[PDB]
């Protein structure tokens, strides 16, 4: 059934499973035309497909060319997502194919379901969680590879860098969601917190700074403080 706070630890068991988030697949700028009418220009997007246990991230870059001459693009975006996910599953060795795919938005269910008909034993699940994966384009390296792409491209990352060398998946996932939640509520402040110290660098093969354990605790504290404050401002509490 649906994934929620109750069955949360199931992410970290040894059943292979993937989150799919489509929130950055069809991206546009909205602008005015010479005649004063509004028009959109698409920019490159991505499917965010992530194994929460291992950190592997299958970043499928959606080049603007895929929208050329197409109608009902926001509807089409859901089907292309499901097409590309299904192809990713087909490309994987049997023993790497997920047992579950969890879509962050319920509108992906039918599209993914229809594309996966060939995989009747892969369960497609919605979730009641409010995951921040739309903020994935606030990670500089991810945003850069998307915006620079000139054709369809799959790029592979580990979204936990080397954390699992030192912490469990559960803890790694809570770090990732806290970082992305903060980037989502206030990107400028979030990014400030992460790079304030010029002496902590991002390895070339990494996405995040090489904080020590103790520095991660200060960071996580700084990110929690950011999130709470924005909440009072939003609701005047």
């Amino acid at each position: 059934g649906a994934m929620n706070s109750s069955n949360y630890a199931e992410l970290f068991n040894n059943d292979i499973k993937l989150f799919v988030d489509d929130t950055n697949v069809y991206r546009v700028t909205v602008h005015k035309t010479f005649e004063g009418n509004v028009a959109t220009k698409a920019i490159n997007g991505c499917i965010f497909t992530l194994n929460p246990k291992t950190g592997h991230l299958f970043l499928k870059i959606i080049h603007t060319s895929v929208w050329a001459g197409q109608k009902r693009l926001s509807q089409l975006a859901k089907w292309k997502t499901a097409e590309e996910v299904s192809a990713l599953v087909r490309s994987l060795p049997k023993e790497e194919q997920p047992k579950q795919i969890i879509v962050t938005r319920k509108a992906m269910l039918d599209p993914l379901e229809v594309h996966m008909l060939d995989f009747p034993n892969i369960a497609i699940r919605p979730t009641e969680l409010r995951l921040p994966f739309s903020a994935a384009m606030s990670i500089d390296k991810l945003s850069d590879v998307v915006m620079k792409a000139t054709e369809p491209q799959m790029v592979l990352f580990n979204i936990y860098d080397d954390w699992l060398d030192r912490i469990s998946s559960y803890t790694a996932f809570s770090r990732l969601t806290l970082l992305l939640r903060a980037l989502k509520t206030n990107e400028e402040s979030a990014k400030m917190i992460l790079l304030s110290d010029p002496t902590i660098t991002i390895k070339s093969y990494h996405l995040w700074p090489s904080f020590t354990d103790e520095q991660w605790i200060t960071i996580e504290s700084q990110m929690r403080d950011l999130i709470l404050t924005e909440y009072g401002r939003k609701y005047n509490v």
Partner: protein, 300 residues
Amino acid sequence: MNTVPFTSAPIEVTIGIDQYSFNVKENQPFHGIKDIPIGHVHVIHFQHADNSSMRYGYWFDCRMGNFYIQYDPKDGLYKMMEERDGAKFENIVHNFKERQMMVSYPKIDEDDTWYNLTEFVQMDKIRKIVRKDENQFSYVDSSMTTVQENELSDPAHSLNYTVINFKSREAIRPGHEMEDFLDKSYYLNTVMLQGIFKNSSNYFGELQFAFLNAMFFGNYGSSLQWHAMIELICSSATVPKHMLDKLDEILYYQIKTLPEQYSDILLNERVWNICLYSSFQKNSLHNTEKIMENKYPELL
């Protein structure tokens, strides 16, 4: 004009024939139904005064033989049987008429309702959905489950309706995922009309038969089947013009005939709101839309 005699009426029961019905008291001298219009299928049905559970009944066609009803005190129900001795049967019928113990099938001459509800229903097809080949008539009751329902137990007692499933390989051509799921014309016209049903009349016929079983027996999987077959047509962008017009006529009479108090379980809000207002064929069901709004605007 044909006759279905009854041996007796030992238990208090409400007896239906097609859309008509009569209360018969325990051991009332009821001995049958006469003047049944030849040329259509018919259903005779029962609901015991003591068990408003399990409505049950027999689909039949008097051209296919002489049928009569007899209560079975062991199995506890009114059973349909065939009399093969043609002379023994006219004798029974003539004497019961003479003694005037039979009701007349009460058709108003202006009335095309039964024709309109059974236009495409053919006994030969009914006997394929309800498989019991030693009998020429077909039993259905409230609780029989469908082949589709069974897949998700006893097959001898199943309703073998044609399985429709919008999220199956059957329904979706590889490479046309989005197209075929949003526009079911290929499932409808190639898979179901050309492939399985062969023509629109047999399609209409199963649809009509499923409605009728949902109405007369409250058979829930029949109701699911009737809705599925409407939705496939309404969710197809490309439907022969002859089917659309006929569909509006079919639904119209079905909506017209349904007991008013039953609209809540027999009518599926989603399917109807999608067919009448969102689907490709929203504007092709003018009579069905008009009757639905003036009679069940709540559901919509």
